[PDB]
């Protein structure tokens, strides 16, 4: 709305109450909208005796389709916006505006790849709360989107040339952060729950789990026209909202199709004590707050 002249404000995307708020909002949205046939959550508050909470309910098939959300100022507060096109999300911003609301954010729940979000306006950007810490997630923001087309028939397609150009841009940014003489290597997820080992997302109300090995298997600064990822629709899933499991009914549509734009990634670096002149990066995610951070990094709420 209105640019603040000569004002310098500190931002910290990793400690932003707007993220926590959006997170609780999306959890509520899912509870009301997407009801599982069976829902299981742990409860081991007792002494050496666990009590799994089990909910069984009607579970209608519903075509899920994220709708943009705009966050406006909560009572007694104002929203500030960093106008710096290459802002890393953590530090002083010399070009600050006050806005009535954020842009429209689509609350896509996914791992590994960020879909249908905002692109960087200039060059590719990478963000982390601590790059030196191999355990902290690296959020990647693309400046050019890449199409991914998925079908309930069991696969997702991605143009190989476009993806290859994307990896090169990312690796160049990773070199610039970790070392100009380092080889940048992408590898598949090293393990964990199926939801984070695969690129997982929801399409047509169904839960997809796509093998992303072919997307993350290259060496930088040391095929076919289209990359086809094998996928699987699951009925029994681990919940992202909290620790638990949910069961959904099988699909009722023989034509489940969606195309999304990859606009970002979630990565982690292997690290470890290695005198080797290379860094290894694998797809990550799982904490959906990182998904919300990828959109909200440029906003903060301040009390009037």
């Amino acid at each position, epitope marked *: 709305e209105v640019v603040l002249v000569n004002v310098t404000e500190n931002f910290n995307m990793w400690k932003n109450d707007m993220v926590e708020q959006m997170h609780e909002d999306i959890i509520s949205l899912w509870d009301q909208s997407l009801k599982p*046939c*069976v829902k*299981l959550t742990p409860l081991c508050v007792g002494a050496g005796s666990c009590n*799994t909470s*089990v909910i*069984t*309910q*009607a*579970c209608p098939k519903v075509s899920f389709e994220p709708i943009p959300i705009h966050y406006c100022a909560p009572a007694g507060f104002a929203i500030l916006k960093c106008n710096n096109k290459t802002f890393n999300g953590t530090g002083p911003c010399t070009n600050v505006s006050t806005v009535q609301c954020t842009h429209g954010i689509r609350p896509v729940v996914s791992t590994q790849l960020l879909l249908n979000g905002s692109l960087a306006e200039e060059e590719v950007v990478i963000r982390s709360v601590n790059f030196t810490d191999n355990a902290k997630t690296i959020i990647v923001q693309l400046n050019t989107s890449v199409e991914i087309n998925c079908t309930g028939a069991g696969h997702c397609n991605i143009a190989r040339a476009k993806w290859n150009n994307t990896l090169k841009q990312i690796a160049s940014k990773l070199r610039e952060q970790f070392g100009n003489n380092k080889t940048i290597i992408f590898k598949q997820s090293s393990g964990g729950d*199926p939801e984070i080992v695969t690129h997982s997302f929801n399409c047509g109300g169904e839960f997809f*789990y796509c093998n992303s090995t072919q997307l993350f298997n290259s060496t930088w600064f040391n095929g076919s026209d289209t990359i086809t990822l094998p996928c*699987r629709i*699951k*009925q*029994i*899933i681990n919940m992202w909202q909290k620790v638990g*499991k949910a*069961m959904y*009914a*099988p699909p009722i549509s023989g034509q489940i199709r969606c195309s999304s734009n990859i606009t970002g990634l979630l990565l982690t670096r292997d690290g470890g004590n290695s005198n080797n002149e290379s860094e290894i990066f694998r797809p990550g995610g799982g904490d959906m707050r990182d998904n919300w951070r990828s959109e909200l990094y440029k906003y903060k709420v301040v009390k009037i």
Partner: antibody
Amino acid sequence: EVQLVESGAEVKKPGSSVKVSCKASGDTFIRYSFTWVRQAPGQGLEWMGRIITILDVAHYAPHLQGRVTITADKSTSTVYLELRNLRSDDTAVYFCAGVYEGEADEGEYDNNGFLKHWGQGTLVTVSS
Amino acid sequence: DIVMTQSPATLSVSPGERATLSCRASESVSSDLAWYQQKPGQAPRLLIYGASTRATGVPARFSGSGSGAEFTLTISSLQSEDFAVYYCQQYNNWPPRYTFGQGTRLEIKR
């Protein structure tokens, strides 16, 4: 496919409880759901309940809710039915039955309600 | 409570001829409908599920049809081993409260 072998006939006084078992052999236990069905002499089949083995979650017929328990021991591939506060009219043959649900260990689950595999039955007589 | 009703209670058919068994639901159960065969002293045997799909080991002379609240089991040519009691089963609801018809006894007409 799976072979279901049930425990032997039971004789009970009204008010007692009974626990019948069913050993499943021949296939991956957790890829099946199991159901108990009973049949009073001269009468038809009656659905009692069904356990989703992979989740350890059972659901019961309303007229039995509260006095029936279905469990599964994944370590012995054995399914159990417990019926409490037995009545003379609980006299029946009790069948264990099951159906393949898909690759459950990989999150695939058809939630099939029909019954492909059947045990030989267990006579439970409840009488004074 | 979905109530399943079968008719007739007894069907008398001459060997080698066609038999038609009816199953009715008190409300729609879509195609979540199964047919079983039971001989005296034995466990039931699954014949049809999903209203019209034959289970493994079931001869082609058995065929199921219907959807919604009315269903049919047809046996195109009765063999000696086809004379038995037949039950339909509804498994459409959730939470599950599955129910059976009271059976149709198929006997030999002489």
